[PDB]
Amino acid sequence: LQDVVTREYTINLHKRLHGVNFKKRAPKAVKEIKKFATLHMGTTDVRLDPKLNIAIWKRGVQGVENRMRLRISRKRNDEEDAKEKLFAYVEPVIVPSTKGLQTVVVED
Amino acid sequence: ANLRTQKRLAASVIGVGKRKVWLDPNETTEIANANSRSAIRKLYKNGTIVKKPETVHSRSRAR
Amino acid sequence: SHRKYEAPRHGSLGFLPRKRAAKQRGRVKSFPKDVKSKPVALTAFLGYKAGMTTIVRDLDRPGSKMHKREVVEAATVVDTPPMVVVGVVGYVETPRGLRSLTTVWAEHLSEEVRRRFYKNWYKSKKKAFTKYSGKYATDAKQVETELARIKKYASVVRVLAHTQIKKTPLSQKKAHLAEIQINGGSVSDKVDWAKEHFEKEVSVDSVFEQDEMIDVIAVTKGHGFEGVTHRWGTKKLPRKTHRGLRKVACIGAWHPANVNWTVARAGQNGYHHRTSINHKVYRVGKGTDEANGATEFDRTKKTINPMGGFVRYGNVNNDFVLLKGSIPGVKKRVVTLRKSLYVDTSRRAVEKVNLKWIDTASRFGKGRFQTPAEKHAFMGTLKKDL
Amino acid sequence: VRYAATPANPAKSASARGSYLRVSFKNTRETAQAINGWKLEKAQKYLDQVLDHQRAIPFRRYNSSIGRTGQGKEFGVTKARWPAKSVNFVKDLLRNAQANAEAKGLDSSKLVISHIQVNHAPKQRRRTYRAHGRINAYQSTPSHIELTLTEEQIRLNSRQRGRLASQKRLTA
RNA sequence: GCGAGAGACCGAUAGCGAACAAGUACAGUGAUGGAAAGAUGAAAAGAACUUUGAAAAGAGAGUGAAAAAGUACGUGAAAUUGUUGAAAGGGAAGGGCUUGAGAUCAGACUUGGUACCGGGCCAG
RNA sequence: UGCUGUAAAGCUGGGUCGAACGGCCUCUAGUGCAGAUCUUGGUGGUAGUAGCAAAUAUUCAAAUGAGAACUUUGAAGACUGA
RNA sequence: UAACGAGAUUCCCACUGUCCCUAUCUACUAUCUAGCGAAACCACAGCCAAGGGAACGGGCUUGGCAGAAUCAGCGGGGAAAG
Numbered sequence A: 001l002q003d004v005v006t007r008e009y010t011i012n013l014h015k016r017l018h019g020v021n022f023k024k025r026a027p028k029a030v031k032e033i034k035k036f037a038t039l040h041m042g043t044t045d046v047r048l049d050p051k052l053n054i055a056i057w058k059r060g061v062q063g064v065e066n067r068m069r070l071r072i073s074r075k076r077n078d079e080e081d082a083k084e085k086l087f088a089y090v091e092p093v094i095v096p097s098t099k100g101l102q103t104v105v106v107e108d
Numbered sequence B: 001a002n003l004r005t006q007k008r009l010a011a012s013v014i015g016v017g018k019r020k021v022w023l024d025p026n027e028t029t030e031i032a033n034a035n036s037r038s039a040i041r042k043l044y045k046n047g048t049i050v051k052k053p054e055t056v057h058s059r060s061r062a063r
Numbered sequence C: 001s002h003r004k005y006e007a008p009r010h011g012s013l014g015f016l017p018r019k020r021a022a023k024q025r026g027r028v029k030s031f032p033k034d035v036k037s038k039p040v041a042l043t044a045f046l047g048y049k050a051g052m053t054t055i056v057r058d059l060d061r062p063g064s065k066m067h068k069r070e071v072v073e074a075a076t077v078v079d080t081p082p083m084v085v086v087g088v089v090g091y092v093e094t095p096r097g098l099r100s101l102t103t104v105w106a107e108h109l110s111e112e113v114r115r116r117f118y119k120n121w122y123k124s125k126k127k128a129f130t131k132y133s134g135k136y137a138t139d140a141k142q143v144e145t146e147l148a149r150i151k152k153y154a155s156v157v158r159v160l161a162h163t164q165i166k167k168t169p170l171s172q173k174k175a176h177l178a179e180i181q182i183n184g185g186s187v188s189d190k191v192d193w194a195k196e197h198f199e200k201e202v203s204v205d206s207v208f209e210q211d212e213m214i215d216v217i218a219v220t221k222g223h224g225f226e227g228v229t230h231r232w233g234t235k236k237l238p239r240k241t242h243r244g245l246r247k248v249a250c251i252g253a254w255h256p257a258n259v260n261w262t263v264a265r266a267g268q269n270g271y272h273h274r275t276s277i278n279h280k281v282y283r284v285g286k287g288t289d290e291a292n293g294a295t296e297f298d299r300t301k302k303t304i305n306p307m308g309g310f311v312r313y314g315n316v317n318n319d320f321v322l323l324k325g326s327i328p329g330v331k332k333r334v335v336t337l338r339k340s341l342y343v344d345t346s347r348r349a350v351e352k353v354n355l356k357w358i359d360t361a362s363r364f365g366k367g368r369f370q371t372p373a374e375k376h377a378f379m380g381t382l383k384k385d386l
Numbered sequence D: 001v002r003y004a005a006t007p008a009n010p011a012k013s014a015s016a017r018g019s020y021l022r023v024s025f026k027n028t029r030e031t032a033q034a035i036n037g038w039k040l041e042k043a044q045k046y047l048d049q050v051l052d053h054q055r056a057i058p059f060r061r062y063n064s065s066i067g068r069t070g071q072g073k074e075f076g077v078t079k080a081r082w083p084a085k086s087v088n089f090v091k092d093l094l095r096n097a098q099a100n101a102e103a104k105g106l107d108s109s110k111l112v113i114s115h116i117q118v119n120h121a122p123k124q125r126r127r128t129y130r131a132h133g134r135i136n137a138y139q140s141t142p143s144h145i146e147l148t149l150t151e152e153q154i155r156l157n158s159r160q161r162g163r164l165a166s167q168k169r170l171t172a
Numbered sequence E: 001g002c003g004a005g006a007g008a009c010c011g012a013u014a015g016c017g018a019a020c021a022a023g024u025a026c027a028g029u030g031a032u033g034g035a036a037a038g039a040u041g042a043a044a045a046g047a048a049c050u051u052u053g054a055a056a057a058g059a060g061a062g063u064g065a066a067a068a069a070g071u072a073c074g075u076g077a078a079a080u081u082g083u084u085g086a087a088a089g090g091g092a093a094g095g096g097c098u099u100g101a102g103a104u105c106a107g108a109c110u111u112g113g114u115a116c117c118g119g120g121c122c123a124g
Numbered sequence F: 001u002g003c004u005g006u007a008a009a010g011c012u013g014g015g016u017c018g019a020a021c022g023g024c025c026u027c028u029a030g031u032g033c034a035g036a037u038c039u040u041g042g043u044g045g046u047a048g049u050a051g052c053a054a055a056u057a058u059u060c061a062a063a064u065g066a067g068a069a070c071u072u073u074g075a076a077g078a079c080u081g082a
Numbered sequence G: 001u002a003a004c005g006a007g008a009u010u011c012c013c014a015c016u017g018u019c020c021c022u023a024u025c026u027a028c029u030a031u032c033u034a035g036c037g038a039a040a041c042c043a044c045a046g047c048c049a050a051g052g053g054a055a056c057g058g059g060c061u062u063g064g065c066a067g068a069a070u071c072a073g074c075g076g077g078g079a080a081a082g
């Protein structure tokens, strides 16, 4: 068990926003990434970087990209009496292409 | 913690709309102390309050 | 007053109530009538609906305009890996109906059929049939006595068989267990046949031959809550009707002062239990055969599967039954195949069918090729081919 | 102040009250009945899981035309619901009663909810506006809540006597 | 109008509309229309202090003859409601008559007479 | 809790309560309610029900605070479009 | 009687889901949840068939029968409400 760990993932947002109301697409991508981070990190305390919010909304309310490359880090939430000893911080990763990328453990 | 008055005074002092006033996020306490127009001018001079630039409307396509 | 004009009733009163079926596995309400002189044989088989395809055939019906000409026909593919016999049940005649006297199980049960006795398999100790298997260990005299009971008292003998669902592309791991009645011979012959087949596999070809007319029992596609217009096919009210038009305008006269059971109402549509009869067997395919889709007239070395796989099912890699037309149910649905309940001597019942060709173009779009080789030949080399 | 029910041994009991609480009477009655007679810690954990939508409050009397849920199967019902405001008020009152019991030297682990009831408080009036220039009532239905925590010859005829004497003599 | 004395009168939905900051609050452009609302306690002695809580409050404590008088205050009915205890329940419930069962109430051993006399009740 | 009366009603045990009230002979009346779409006040079932859907649309982070979908600041995405 | 007409009427061309004969799609509801939370109406109430009866009964007579608690819909009845 490595509580503190950072990995880079690709999320398929196109299949997660299928049929979604056009004025809820970018807000739902926020919720989808939070659910994505809990699935991989096991924490309901998920925090999104403001730069990730800017990337999600870059092309308006329904302009979300099909695939986004994300860096997710599990970090200790000492902050006693917080209902979660750990939390997930999600930030964007700038790449030339969003295809062909696999899950990679990030060393620091 | 409530800088509504400061936003309004800064807009009046600088000569722009409220939409073009930038109150420093990291200097909340000092701005909250600025109750007069004189204190607002001091903050404006020292860069704690900044006039944002205009949204560009280029006429290049029109020309 | 009388209806101003006469029209037939909308929908059938014989399929009421239009409720959801009690179980998803369609049950055989009645089995073929037992003929003692026949060989001992099964009367039903369980498979999985995989999809539909197209065939070409020469018609053999003298006097028809299409006699000795090719017809194009829709067909259904049923994935039917062999079933495993795991038990036997004996039934006695009573003045209150058939009553099951006892049930005898095989010594060993596979995990897939034992998964059928659990709602939470992974949290359990897997104790199912663990004390029963000790009834064989000492000398199996208890099993012998129960089988002797069945021979002495039962008048109807049915076997307990389950599917091998792990041979299908289904993600479900529970096997479907069903009773199939044993017909032919004496009750003693039936019990002997069941005992010798304990823990053993039985294939479709030992039940259904090609050109046979068979029945299908399944649960139909669900539609949830439906209004009267589609549930019963009643006439739409005019465009200018206040409060809507997908309705029945009059649901009854003043008297009787109650809504009658014969009036169409909104309610759940589909997911009903149906017994459809007289589906001709065009093919009993073999899983080992790599020319399942091939014919004597089309010799391409071809499996029954279409290009890309059956949509939302996968590939049929076992024995299969090719049936004329359509059958109740959806893709992935377990379907029960039953022998005909009567003897049919019409020309369509006794016709020998000879398949010219089976379509294996993609079901995922307007597929224009039957094989990857044909696609490559037509298109030549592509950028990804290098 | 007079409570509706008084404990048998006041030295082993603690009580709490809330009056004129602006919380639904019907939801509060259901939530109070959901934990009546429970161990204090069991009840507190259950209320936390209710606030998490992991378990539900069974609605037994004030439940007409409410929704159905599979979380009612725990209590043998189909109509159950998750009233957050009532749960928060009951939790606050349970915490206060627990503090009182601690101040009286009582053991928290042995405490049981031996009495809890909800009564109607006076209604608070507001107004709502209807079609054709009409005014209707738009009232609140407040609650009074109280709870208490507690640590967990034969005489015979002449003939009957004669019969018994004869029988005793007959058997030794 | 001003000053007095009275009643087989009314007793807070009564008596004047008004026993109260009543021709008040409020409505209508206006002429006009026009309410509701009396009582802790002898005395505020109107609850210091400790404690839980963000607070409102609660629990202790205290004052008082009484808090079953806490400025939601004399008494505090009914409709209606909660909890507790007992009981009953196959498309209403309720009622009369009758008895059973369970509960409650009542009486002659008398205002009994000097171990006996004598009496009460139910029965053969 | 019982007792009396065919009845209208009368008396009594227990609880609550705090300042007046009753029997008898007579006098007198603004003297007895289930109804009047009665009057005034109060309270139910309905019912946690109908419903809280026009005017394009919100999101991330920080601050504050016991508590933040709704406050403030920053960053965006939008709209009114003279 | 030229011209004019959100006036009444007939035919024709064009047009089309008005229709044969319906199907599919979108937003907002309905739905379920947190919070908030009315009203109409209400003798008592609420399963049928026949009978008689103020001559068309939920109750009465004679039969059929009859099992808690319920959710979404619905427009036969309550000679439903106003």
Ligand SMILES: CN[C@@H]1[C@@H](O)[C@@H](O[C@@H]2[C@@H](O)[C@H](O[C@H]3O[C@H]([C@@H](C)O)[C@@H](O)[C@H](O)[C@H]3N)[C@@H](N)C[C@H]2N)OC[C@]1(C)O
Pocket: E012, E037, E038, E039
């Ligand atoms: C606190 N609320 C105030 C208050 O002054 C209120 O007073 C009543 C008072 O009149 C009552 O007292 C009452 O006493 C008798 C008897 C029937 O009780 C009545 O006949 C009498 O009118 C009245 N004084 C009292 N029991 C409760 C207070 N809230 O009266 C007006 C009000 C605005 O509601």
